[PDB]
């Protein structure tokens, strides 16, 4: 900011916010808030939960004081020009609204989403780390620099989802086979092909490799149809499941491998950097 | 002779059967008789070496591992103090004395450990990813897996297999004659849950390794509903399992690239090039 | 040919290259909106009317290229570049499917159902139209071309392991639902299960294990399942509990067979 | 002559591929003799090369030695069938590796040969890393026997992946390293020590095992793969 105008009060205020006591105070304040979030456990006494809710109010109050303190010294315009300050401003708004809706209560309980903003305070530690911040930023920027490589993998899931929807859609899951047939069919109400999203989830589960072979066996021929399928015989499922799942496993692995190498070789300079030789990292320290 | 003694000790350790309760195979006594001889010969080796070095004994790292083995072995062997069963567990580290004996393996172990030092920064980043997801999971899935189908008014589980249940339509609903009840042991005998922060960390960790994360998701769907549970597990796998795998391969690839261009490695490759040229010319 | 110049004016024009690119997008979305369960669902009927429009756009785009470019008469031709054959397959399958639906809807569901699966190739037509996506696609093919030499060695080694596995576990993967009856002739009648707080009677069945080693094809599939990591501990347990051909399992009969899977994991 | 021998191997490779569970009797009768004739012909080319080039030239070549091993290995299997009827290992399928010389006529020979040359050159190292990996598996096996050795006799039976005996301990440790059902094994370890109430401190052993084992395997086998392949590339280019 450096206004050199109001040395009486503004500069005294400004020198305080950019001062070693301030940054470590905020650093310690997050860490204490980190401990508070981890102190929740099941079966606690009503006093213990009362203690935790009180601590949360104190922290967010101090962080709101932190925000209003900074905006005075830096200025309203300068405060919003830095992403981290915007991130701090977003979190404090979420924390205030979450408390306000809770203490009023007596309404819809849908907004447990706002409680995530309490955990978002953890990300502020990453500003302190010199090596970790660089490592994440370079790789994240690489995914930005390569948008179309992710599009190819999305097409692989899109094509295989539609095929599974049509070939294996009508397999019956409604029947509960109690000591008859096989209830152990891996095509249940949670792992079905009945809709596009559920087809995608089954593909993702197979991608991570979670008993996909049993899913392949469950999709073979001779399985019961559905009541609304329009077929009243045990003639649902195809022998195409052998090619469907085996080809998907190989193709999914290959495409992710190319994605991994593409990101690695986008930053292969960073990964092979030498401290003795000048690089952009030292150049950034020069500007600082 | 010392190396042969280590190999014999490894064989003796490998020829042991552990029986439940207090049962002992007849060969156990014969196996145990050998321990005094081995601990004595190791102590003799250590003493003869330390008197010569003058205690540069503890200066070398490998000698320290050999030294602490001898102290623990002689501490429990002499007398039957308390339980001291834990002092038997240190005998597990005796196979590692082969590395100390053979200098050709110490060089190899240096190469493996040198490359993992860059991975330490990744591990710190990986730990901070687990902690964030553990905290989020602790807030949303806290104690939700202690509710199954009990008989109406009777504290007995409806069937031999209890399952999570809910009191509302989006979650799984108990049959007509049964009601959801406040307490149940939980899936996987209570081991898989979000109750403490330690349980949450352990539960998140196995999802990072992509093992048994579908069952946790399907259990969560039954307990609460399938509308929002995917937003917690699918990002967990992608950020946790796939992203860190991307970083680990990248960091290791960079380290291998720098390793190959060290002066020592270049000369070894240059010798291989010249030998093959001679073979081609001789052919 | 004056008439050919008319189509080339349409083809070269930007408003015909960009416009179809949305038609690809809408048609792909319409594919993902179909109800798989119920063919007579109201959603499927409406979406079918859309498929008529999408075929019309693709048919219009197919023909004008046929007038524009000779079919096989030039170095650059319609049937010269694979993407045009890929385009040809999608539209031709739809036209054939429409013709057969008409004669009797009820009588031949299977083909009707079969060629309708070919509509999933509509997303793949985006690769040619987007220059940036083709570069990524060419990168993948380049990576495939580079690892082709190692790949051939890979199947040759896995083929050898498949043959060896066949000669060791051929016919030894038969089990009886009642473990007491080792041979097939004994496995007939009723047998008792003693589970907690009940006694029930079920049939005896002579069954083959789900994943087995009977021919080179079954061995390769089982070894692929082992390599990917899923379910290989159970295949290991069936391998170590195999006695003889056409005979039931006996626990712990061959613990030396664990060496086969250990060597397999170190290699592939 | 060189192509004819390769053609015979393809037919020999085909014959062992045909074998299946329930083969027609004529097919089985055909194969039983057919292995004998193929063994004779590949023993026939053994002698003609033995005399044409000489005994000393024969042993110097590595490919001749490899063919000698397959022939001797095939001899062992034939006699073993009479001695202990019931099992056959099909050692003759290892001769299919001779189809890899087809790459000689192609332009891929230089890249593949240098990969083999680099691997054989750095044989002392590759053995050392595998041995170091073996010792780490052995140590985690002996540690498992101390902690969980005697407490998997549950009321539902002893699990196959127990730490009772040493051979059982190795397989359980090996399975955890590959990561398949490492959580189910950990559940047994926790239940063996009082369950969730009193045995959650033993979960550390599986956490350390899978965390180090997963990345140690990556750091050992990728280092072998990257270094030896990289030597092949530069050595190939310098030849060009």
């Amino acid at each position: 900011h450096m206004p050199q105008n109001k040395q009486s009060f503004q500069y005294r205020m400004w020198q305080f916010v950019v001062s070693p006591p301030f940054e470590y105070t905020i650093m310690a304040m997050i860490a204490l808030n980190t401990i508070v979030l981890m102190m929740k456990f099941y079966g606690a006494s009503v006093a213990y939960e009362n203690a935790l809710r009180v601590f949360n109010i104190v922290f967010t109050s101090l962080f709101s004081l932190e925000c209003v303190l900074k905006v005075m010294a830096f200025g309203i315009l300068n405060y919003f020009r830095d992403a981290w300050n915007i991130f701090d401003f977003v979190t404090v708004l979420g924390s205030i609204t979450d408390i306000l809706v809770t203490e009023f209560g007596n309404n819809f309980i849908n907004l447990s989403f706002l409680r995530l903003f309490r955990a978002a305070r953890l990300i502020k530690l990453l500003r302190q780390g010199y090596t970790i911040r660089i490592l994440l930023w370079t790789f994240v920027q690489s995914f930005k620099a390569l948008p179309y490589v992710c599009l190819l993998i999305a097409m692989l899931f899109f094509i295989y989802a539609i095929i599974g929807m049509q070939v294996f859609g009508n397999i019956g899951i409604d029947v509960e086979d109690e000591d008859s047939d096989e209830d152990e069919f891996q095509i249940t109400e949670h792992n079905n092909f009945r809709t596009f999203f559920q087809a995608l989830m089954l593909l993702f589960r197979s991608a991570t490799g979670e008993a996909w072979h049993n899913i392949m066996l469950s999709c073979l021929s001779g399985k019961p149809c559905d009541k609304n399928s329009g077929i009243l015989t045990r003639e649902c499922g195809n022998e195409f499941a052998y090619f469907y799942f085996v080809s998907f496993i190989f193709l999914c692995s290959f495409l992710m491998l190319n994605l991994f190498v593409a990101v690695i070789m986008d930053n292969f300079e960073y990964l092979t950097r030498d401290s003795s030789i000048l690089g952009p990292h030292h150049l950034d320290e020069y500007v600082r | 002779m010392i190396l042969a003694t280590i190999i014999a000790n490894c064989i003796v350790l490998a020829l042991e059967q552990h029986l439940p309760d207090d049962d002992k195979t007849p060969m156990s006594e014969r196996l145990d008789d050998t321990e005094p001889y081995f601990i004595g010969i190791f102590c003799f080796e250590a003493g003869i070496k330390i008197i010569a070095l003058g205690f540069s004994y503890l200066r070398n790292g490998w000698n320290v591992m050999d030294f602490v083995v001898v102290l623990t072995g002689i501490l429990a062997t002499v007398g039957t103090e308390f339980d001291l069963r834990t002092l038997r567990a240190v005998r597990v580290l005796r196979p590692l004395k082969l590395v100390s004996g053979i200098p050709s393996l110490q060089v190899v172990l240096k190469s493996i450990m040198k490359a993992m030092i860059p991975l330490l920064q990744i591990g710190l980043l990986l730990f901070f990813a687990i902690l964030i997801f553990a905290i989020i999971g602790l807030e949303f899935y806290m104690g939700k897996f202690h509710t199954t189908c009990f008989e109406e008014g009777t504290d007995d589980i409806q069937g031999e297999s209890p399952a999570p249940c809910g009191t509302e339509e989006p979650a799984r609903t108990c049959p007509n004659g049964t009601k959801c009840q406040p307490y149940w042991e939980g899936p996987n005998n209570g081991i898989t849950q979000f109750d403490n922060i330690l349980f949450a960390v352990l539960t998140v960790f196995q999802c990072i390794t992509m093992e048994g994360w579908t069952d946790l998701l399907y259990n969560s769907n039954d307990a609460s509903g399938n509308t929002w549970n995917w937003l917690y597990f699918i990002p967990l796998i992608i950020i946790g399992s796939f992203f860190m795998l991307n970083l680990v391969l990248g960091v290791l690839s960079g380290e291998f690239a720098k390793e190959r261009e060290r002066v020592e490695n270049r000369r070894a490759f240059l010798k291989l090039r010249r030998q093959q040229q001679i073979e081609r010319e001789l052919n | 040919n004056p008439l050919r110049r008319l189509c080339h004016y349409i083809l070269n024009l930007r408003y015909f290259e960009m416009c179809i690119l949305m038609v690809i997008a809408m048609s792909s979305i319409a594919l993902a909106a179909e109800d798989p369960v119920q063919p007579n669902a109201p959603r499927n009927n409406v979406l079918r009317y859309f498929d008529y429009v999408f075929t019309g756009v693709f048919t219009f785009e197919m023909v004008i290229k046929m007038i524009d470019l000779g079919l096989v008469l030039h170095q650059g031709a319609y049937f010269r570049d694979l993407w045009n054959i890929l385009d040809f397959i999608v539209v031709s399958g739809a036209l054939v499917a429409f013709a057969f639906t008409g004669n009797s809807k009820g009588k031949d569901i299977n083909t009707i159902k079969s060629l309708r699966v070919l509509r999933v190739l509509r997303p793949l037509k985006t690769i040619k139209r987007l220059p940036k996506l083709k570069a990524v696609f060419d990168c993948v093919v380049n990576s495939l071309k580079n690892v082709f030499n190692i790949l051939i060695v890979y199947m040759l080694f896995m083929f050898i392991f498949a043959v060896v596995a066949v000669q060791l576990f051929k016919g030894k993967f038969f089990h009886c639902t009642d473990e007491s009856k080792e041979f097939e002739k004994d496995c007939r009648g009723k047998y008792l299960l003693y589970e907690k707080n009940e006694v029930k009677a079920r049939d005896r069945e002579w069954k083959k294990y789900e994943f087995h080693y009977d021919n080179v094809l079954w061995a390769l599939l089982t070894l692929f399942t082992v390599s990917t990591g899923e379910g290989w501990p159970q295949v290991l347990k069936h391998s170590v509990d195999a006695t003889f051909e056409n005979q039931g399992p006996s626990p712990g009969y061959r613990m030396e067979m664990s060496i086969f899977y250990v060597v397999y994991f170190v290699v592939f | 002559f060189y192509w004819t021998v390769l053609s015979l191997v393809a037919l020999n490779t085909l014959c062992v591929a045909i074998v299946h569970y329930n083969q027609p009797e004529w097919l089985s009768d055909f194969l039983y003799y057919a292995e004998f004739i193929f063994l004779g012909l590949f023993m026939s080319e053994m002698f003609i090369k033995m005399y044409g080039l000489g005994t000393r030239p024969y042993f110097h070549s590595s490919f001749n030695c490899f063919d000698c091993g397959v022939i001797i290995g095939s001899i062992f299997e034939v006699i073993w069938a009479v001695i202990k009827p019931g099992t056959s290992f099909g050692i003759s399928v290892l001769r299919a590796l001779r189809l890899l010389r087809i790459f000689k006529v192609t332009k891929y020979w230089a890249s593949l040969r240098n990969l083999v040359v680099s691997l054989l050159n750095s044989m002392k190292s590759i053995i050392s890393l595998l041995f170091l990996l073996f010792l780490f598996i052995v140590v985690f096996a002996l540690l498992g026997m101390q902690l969980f050795g005697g407490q998997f006799n549950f009321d539902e039976g002893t699990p196959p992946t127990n730490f009772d005996t040493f051979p059982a301990a190795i397989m359980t440790v090996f399975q955890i390293l590959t990561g398949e059902d490492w959580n189910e094994v950990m559940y047994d370890g926790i239940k063996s020590q009082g369950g969730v109430q009193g045995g959650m401190v033993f979960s550390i052993y599986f956490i350390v095992l899978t965390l180090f084992g997963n990345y140690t395997l990556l750091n050992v086998f990728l280092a072998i793969a990257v270094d030896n392949l990289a030597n092949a590339q530069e050595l190939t280019k310098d030849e060009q």
Binding site: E182 | - | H175, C176, L193, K207, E210 | G157, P160
Partner: peptide, 26 residues
């Protein structure tokens, strides 16, 4: 080889078909 619907433990691998299910039964 435990029958279908009998209580099972996954580490056993004794289940006749498939594996030990989520609910703990074959």
């Amino acid at each position: 080889c435990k029958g279908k619907g009998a209580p099972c433990r996954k580490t056993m691998y004794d289940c006749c078909s498939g594996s030990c299910g989520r609910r703990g039964k074959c």
